[PDB]
Design a binder for these strands. Structure first.
Ligand SMILES: [Mg+2]
Ligand SMILES: [Mg+2]
Ligand SMILES: [Mg+2]
Ligand SMILES: [Mg+2]
Ligand SMILES: [Mg+2]
Ligand SMILES: [Mg+2]
Ligand SMILES: [Mg+2]
Ligand SMILES: [Mg+2]
Ligand SMILES: [Mg+2]
Ligand SMILES: [Mg+2]
Ligand SMILES: [Mg+2]
Ligand SMILES: [Mg+2]
Ligand SMILES: [Mg+2]
Ligand SMILES: [Zn+2]
Lengths: 39, 64, 77, 193, 103, 136, 140, 135
RNA sequence: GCCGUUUAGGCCACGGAAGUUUGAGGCAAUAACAGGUCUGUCAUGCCCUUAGAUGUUCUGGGCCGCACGCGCGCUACACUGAUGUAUUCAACGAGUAUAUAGCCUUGGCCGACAGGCCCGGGUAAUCUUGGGAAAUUUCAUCGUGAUGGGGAUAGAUCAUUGCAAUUGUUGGUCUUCAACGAGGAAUGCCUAGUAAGCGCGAGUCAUCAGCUCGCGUUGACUACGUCCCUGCCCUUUGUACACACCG
């Protein structure tokens, strides 16, 4: 009973820091949120 | 009866052997500081090192 | 070396190591250790590790204690 | 060489003489640069070639005691074994325990070996000389392994397995793992000359 | 009359935040206020590692996203209007100001 | 010196090796572990730096009392191994050959039960939910 | 005015050796230096002292507070803290050319009683559970 | 005083002191307990209870504000779980709490404001007096 | 400083924190593969079904089943050790109104462990936590014995999570004490804070970490090379190959 706020997927979900994104929709929106891939 | 004879590596020639595991060197006999013959050393060896040699007649050839 | 299996066989506490033998077993190289005695004599430990104290209270030798239970032995003087 | 500095603060480095001038260059014992209180130094050896020839030799012995996984890196334990070991050596020999080890390094290092070289276009093992630094490296290796194997599943302690090993090796008796492994290497190498 | 007013600054941007930080300091230094700052706080670094693939195939390869967060503090011995009289300069994009009245 | 020294002790039909140390010779009984062996020695008040073939006949008597009768020497309820039994309801500390029985007696129940854990033992396959593809 | 606060570093062990012009005290977090608790790696802490001398310390006292690292790294740390703190005191309070003798005692023995190791824990990278080690590879 | 003396040999002295310093009470669960979840056997030594006291009478001497949920950590250790990897394990608090109770009744330590357990004015004396009585 | 068309550059040496681009990572060309992903995406053509549904929803079961073969691993086969004392040194991260204390949880008390009851601190360099980590270091006990190594298997009971624990969620207590004596043919990773050892944090998460991603702690042996095996780049050469030598 926890899905992605973007797509509604039940798997690979990231609750860390309260994003509630799946591991794929996050990667799609990662830079927009402001997670810079410094390394 | 061979007598263990000492020599000194004057210089280093190459790294022979299939895997390169053999440094070829020129040795300087201490009893007679005139005999410069090729020998084949295993292990890290620079000039100024002293090789113990059981025999001496066994002489390495060029690019042996 | 059944030398914890031998700790109560009456030979031991009668004399076996009260100079019955262990005059000698240091004298192989004159102060051979508590553990060389422990295996240069085929008998091993803990009949010995009790007597490592016993000969010490008897004032025949001087001894050490440390980490691995390394312990030492001396003959005379 | 000058300096009254001693290992564990008990054993003098002067009055140790290394006979074979062949590897007198790589026994880091004799010169006053090599004297150290403890065989434990975090020196950046292995950084360059031949640099580990400068490591004090009692440390090189110590470094090799830490093998087979359950001993890797446990250097305080390894050095503590060394202290007990030299207690035992002077206990059994009443000579300079430093002399014993360096004589045990010098007697148990193979002077020859067989390597697969190819002359004329066909390869096979052929007889070769051994450089002094690998000889020291090999002399250490044989002693430590032999002491290791005997102590395993033995009531005897490692410190004293090491001690018997070094005493027998410095004498040169055919009683040490190092001695028998040395002579089988020479005999093979002699045959394939 | 003379209180303990603390201004707290957070942002995702090193350069941008020290623009505001120094301006506030030089803002009040021109008023000769008791300005005790900036106390520089350990940078927080939010982190996410995610598998690069959408299908779990190929050499498993990981990308470490992260976010730096910088924490700055200024002390002013001043009034609730002197603090606001100063802190009215153009706050640069995104920088967080949360002035509160300390103890 | 153990002038009468015994090499075996036969306690509770188990042939206890007398040249072991007490607490580590008593564990040879089926039902006495190292923990419970220790506490028996404490309550019987017997020196541990002793080899069991050196130990006296009276001392064995006290040891056997407290193991057959643990609840009367204030042994707390939680050292025992038949806690809250199903037949009588009592709290007992089973010993050498009664262990061999009650195990099947438990098994015999569940086999008559038609329990899953009974038919699991009956088939011989693993009983506790461990996977059973390529192990065991 | 004799007061110097000189540090030494190893991996994470940082030691700060505050000094005053006293008689002989050397205390690590208040505890005597003669008691630090690798008793095999005790000569390493004592190493600066047997290098220079108890005499060189006859007018100074040492309080060497430590934090971080491990056990071995700290002993290599206190070594520099003691060794460096002496020359900084000598540089500032005794003579500049009476410390040139002291330095060459420390430097001819070991070069790392004045200058730290830059060596640090290389980061872990994925595809394996070490800095260099990689997960075991299987083909069939 | 306390820091000039070996933190080991000294506690032997203080373990011989709480024997013969009169006496106190002592649990009727003392000789069974393993002192931790992860231990294999109860403490070997008979007079371990005072050694645990003596070892833990220096804790408050050399610190301040230690509760029972922290005293458990101080004596915990590694735990081997057989098949599964070993971890850290926190020891038991019944032993730790009671040692405090006894030394509380005896005037070496007291309960502490701001939370914890704090050393007494006069208990500091004996931990420094017996400290002087060590080689 | 020697070497070199004395060019570009090479080896070394004092100095220096540092002389493999100082270390390690991020990014990373053209052309492709019928590589994987329609089961991440109300991204998606075509086809199938569309109320007696391949839609949704609920109950229960299964994905976990066990003759067997395989891969990554954990724990070991002990004395360089097991246990029981005493002693004590990190770093990276983490705390969604979490409801009437609530996620991280200090301190008090009850309790043998497990776990409770109580007063609270912290939306955090402020409280948890300066994260009192383990290996280690000491001191004893064991004594070459499938032993007190090892901890599979199983019996009895207790407590916690949750709406629910059965095909044991897990954590306790007692008891049970298996294989394993360093592993054949084969084969992996690895060149200095590295390998190896040790533990910690985070993801998942109500509960479960033998996993993965990070962190620190102790800390080496060996090599400073070659093209021999496996492959890669460039040139020359031969081809009856072009889905290209698996031709
Ligand atoms: Mg042994
Ligand atoms: Mg382990
Ligand atoms: Mg680079
Ligand atoms: Mg897709
Ligand atoms: Mg599955
Ligand atoms: Mg994998
Ligand atoms: Mg065990
Ligand atoms: Mg231990
Ligand atoms: Mg976890
Ligand atoms: Mg290369
Ligand atoms: Mg042709
Ligand atoms: Mg064609
Ligand atoms: Mg063909
Ligand atoms: Zn999504």
């Amino acid at each position: 009973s926890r899905v992605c706020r973007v797509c509604g997927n039940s798997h690979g979900l990231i609750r860390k820091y309260g994003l509630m994104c799946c591991r794929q929709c996050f990667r799609s929106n990662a830079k927009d949120i402001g997670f810079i891939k410094y390394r | 009866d061979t007598q263990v004879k000492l020599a000194v590596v004057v210089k280093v020639m190459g790294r022979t052997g299939s895997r390169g595991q053999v440094t070829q060197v020129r040795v300087k006999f201490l009893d007679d500081q005139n005999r410069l013959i090729m020998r084949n050393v295993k292990g890290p060896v620079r000039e100024g090192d002293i090789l113990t040699l059981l025999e001496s007649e066994r002489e390495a050839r060029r690019l042996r | 070396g059944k030398q914890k299996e031998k700790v109560n066989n009456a030979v031991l506490f009668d004399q076996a190591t009260y100079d019955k033998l262990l005059t000698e077993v240091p004298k192989y190289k004159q102060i051979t250790p508590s553990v060389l005695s422990e295996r240069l004599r085929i008998n091993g430990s803990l009949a010995r590790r009790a007597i490592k104290d016993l000969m010490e209270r008897g004032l025949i030798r001087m001894v050490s204690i440390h980490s691995s239970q390394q312990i030492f032995t001396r003959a005379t003087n | 060489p000058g300096g009254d500095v001693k290992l564990f603060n008990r054993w003098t480095f002067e009055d140790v003489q290394v006979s074979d001038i062949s590897l007198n260059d790589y026994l880091a014992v004799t010169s006053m640069k090599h004297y150290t209180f403890l065989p434990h130094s975090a020196g950046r050896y292995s950084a360059k070639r031949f640099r580990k020839a400068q490591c004090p030799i009692i440390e090189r012995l110590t470094n090799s005691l830490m093998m087979h996984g359950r001993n890797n890196g446990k250097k305080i334990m390894a050095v503590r074994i060394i202290k007990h070991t030299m207690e035992i050596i002077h206990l059994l020999t009443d000579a300079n325990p430093i002399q014993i080890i360096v004589d045990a390094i010098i007697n148990s290092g193979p002077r020859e070996d067989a390597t697969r070289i190819g002359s004329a276009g066909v390869v096979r093992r052929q007889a070769v000389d051994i450089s002094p630094l690998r000889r020291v490296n090999q002399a250490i290796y044989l002693l430590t392994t032999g002491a290791r194997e005997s102590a395993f599943r033995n009531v005897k302690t490692i410190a004293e397995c090491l001690a018997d090993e070094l005493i027998n090796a410095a004498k040169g008796s055919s009683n040490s793992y190092a001695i028998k492994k040395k002579d089988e290497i020479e005999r093979v190498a002699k045959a394939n000359r | 009359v003379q209180h303990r007013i603390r201004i707290t600054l957070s942002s995702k941007s090193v350069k941008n935040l020290e623009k505001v930080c120094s301006d506030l300091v030089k803002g009040a230094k021109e008023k000769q206020l008791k300005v005790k700052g900036p106390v520089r706080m350990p940078t927080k670094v939010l982190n996410i590692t995610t598998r690069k693939s959408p299908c779990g195939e190929g050499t498993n390869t990981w990308d470490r996203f992260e976010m730096r967060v910088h924490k700055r503090v200024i002390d002013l011995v001043s009034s609730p209007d002197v603090v606001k009289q100063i802190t009215s300069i153009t706050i640069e994009p995104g920088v967080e100001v949360e002035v509160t009245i300390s103890d | 010196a153990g002038e009468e020294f015994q090499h075996i002790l036969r306690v509770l039909n188990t042939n206890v090796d007398g040249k072991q140390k007490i607490m580590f010779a008593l564990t040879s009984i089926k039902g006495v572990g190292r923990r419970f062996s220790n506490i028996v020695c404490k309550k019987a008040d017997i020196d541990m730096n002793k080899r069991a073939g050196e130990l006296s006949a009276e001392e064995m008597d006290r040891l056997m009392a407290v193991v057959h009768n643990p609840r009367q020497f204030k042994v707390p309820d939680w050292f025992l191994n038949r806690k809250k039994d199903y037949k009588d309801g009592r709290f007992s500390q089973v010993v050498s050959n009664a262990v061999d029985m009650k195990l099947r007696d438990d098994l015999e129940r569940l086999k008559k039960i038609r329990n899953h854990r009974g038919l699991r033992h009956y088939w011989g396959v693993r009983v506790r939910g461990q996977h059973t593809k390529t192990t065991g | 005015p004799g007061t110097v606060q000189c540090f030494g570093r190893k991996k994470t062990a940082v030691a700060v050796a505050y000094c005053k012009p006293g008689r002989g005290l050397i205390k690590v977090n208040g505890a005597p230096i003669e008691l630090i608790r690798p008793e095999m790696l005790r000569l390493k802490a004592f190493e600066p002292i047997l290098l220079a001398g108890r005499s060189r310390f006859k007018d100074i006292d040492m309080r060497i507070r430590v934090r971080g690292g491990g056990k071995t790294s700290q002993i290599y740390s206190i070594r520099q803290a003691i060794a460096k703190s002496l020359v900084a005191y000598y540089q500032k309070y005794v003579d500049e050319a009476a410390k040139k003798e002291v330095k060459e005692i420390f430097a001819r023995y070991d070069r790392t009683l004045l200058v730290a190791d830059p060596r640090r824990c290389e980061p872990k990278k994925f595809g394996g559970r070490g800095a260099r080690a990689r997960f075991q590879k299987s083909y069939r | 005083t306390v820091k000039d003396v070996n933190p080991h040999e000294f506690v032997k002295a203080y373990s011989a002191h709480l024997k013969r310093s009169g006496k106190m009470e002592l649990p009727e669960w003392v000789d069974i307990v393993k002192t931790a979840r992860f231990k294999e056997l109860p403490p070997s030594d008979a007079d371990w209870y005072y050694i645990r006291a003596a070892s833990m009478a220096r804790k408050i001497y050399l610190r301040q504000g230690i509760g029972i949920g922290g005293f458990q950590k101080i004596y915990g250790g590694r735990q081997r779980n057989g098949s599964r990897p070993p971890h850290f394990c926190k020891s038991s608090g019944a032993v730790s709490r009671n040692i405090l109770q006894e030394l509380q009744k005896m005037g070496i330590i007291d309960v502490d404001p701001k939370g914890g357990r704090l050393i007494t004015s006069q208990g500091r004396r004996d931990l420094d007096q017996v400290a002087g009585t060590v080689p």
